[PDB]
Amino acid sequence: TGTTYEAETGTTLTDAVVETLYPGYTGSGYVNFNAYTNSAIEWNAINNMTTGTKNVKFRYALESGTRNLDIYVNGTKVLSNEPFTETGSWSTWGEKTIQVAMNSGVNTLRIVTTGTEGPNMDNITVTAS
Ligand SMILES: [Ca+2]
Ligand SMILES: [Ca+2]
């Protein structure tokens, strides 16, 4: 089974802030990206048992539209403009899972806005595929 990492703690934020306005988040809050481009959340301590493909499941809210994020693993961009589709409400928390390669031990994962801003981000769950 997996490990959940909160977006709001254990992370470095760039042009993004922790908030609690919309209910239903896990932990102490969620992250609101503020800039249409170059806002970011970086997890610096994702800790895996093995090297291989991981399921990374984002819990997020997005009232309308699709917003795209670049995704970096260990400093290298591995997904470009990955879509996050609407959930319908800022208090509807949906899920999106990507499959990405990661290493055993401690890894970093960063998600970055690229022109469409971002979903409000609650947490990620990482599971070996
Ligand atoms: Ca925002
Ligand atoms: Ca959270």
Side-chain angles (χ1 to χ4, degrees), residues 1-48 50-129:
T1 194
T3 304
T4 297
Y5 302 87
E6 291 303 341
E8 63 271 19
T9 53
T11 58
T12 299
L13 305 183
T14 303
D15 288 307
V17 296
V18 178
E19 293 180 333
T20 59
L21 176 60
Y22 296 106
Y25 54 81
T26 295
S28 60
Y30 57 86
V31 172
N32 180 354
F33 298 93
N34 294 124
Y36 273 73
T37 66
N38 294 142
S39 290
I41 305 170
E42 182 183 16
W43 287 268
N44 59 287
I46 292 162
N47 191 153
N48 297 323
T50 64
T51 295
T53 302
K54 309 305 175 187
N55 294 333
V56 179
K57 179 174 63 182
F58 299 89
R59 186 168 189 263
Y60 75 96
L62 177 50
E63 177 182 76
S64 67
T66 295
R67 300 185 177 185
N68 316 121
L69 305 178
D70 280 348
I71 308 200
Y72 296 74
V73 169
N74 299 134
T76 298
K77 194 189 304 181
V78 299
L79 306 169
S80 164
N81 274 359
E82 183 68 19
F84 285 70
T85 62
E86 65 180 65
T87 67
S89 173
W90 296 116
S91 73
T92 298
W93 298 93
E95 292 179 343
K96 172 184 162 72
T97 299
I98 62 176
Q99 308 168 237
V100 291
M102 307 187 87
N103 294 334
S104 68
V106 181
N107 299 68
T108 68
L109 187 151
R110 186 167 60 120
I111 67 181
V112 191
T113 67
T114 64
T116 47
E117 226 247 43
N120 288 345
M121 188 60 64
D122 187 20
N123 70 222
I124 57 173
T125 303
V126 181
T127 302
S129 294

